[PDB]
Amino acid sequence: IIEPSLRQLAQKYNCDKMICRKCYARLHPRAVNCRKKKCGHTNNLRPKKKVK
Template identity: 85%
Template sequence: MICRKCYARLPPRATNCRKRKCGHTNQLRPKKKLK
């Protein structure tokens, strides 16, 4: 997973970001799969 606010790379099953600078936001998106 990627955080939409700070672009941190998170574990695949994450529900919110672990970084403090984005306030542990829950706005995540899956990492784009390579073709």
């Protein structure tokens, strides 16, 4: 098993993110708008699904 601090560190780059509900782009956890021009910088954002 992965040590918890390393468990959390890897999740910071893979899991703890926000997802656009129009272009699915990976966004930082504090995102309020998507950064991709294809969606018109929408505010329709959802958290990235967790395995738990």
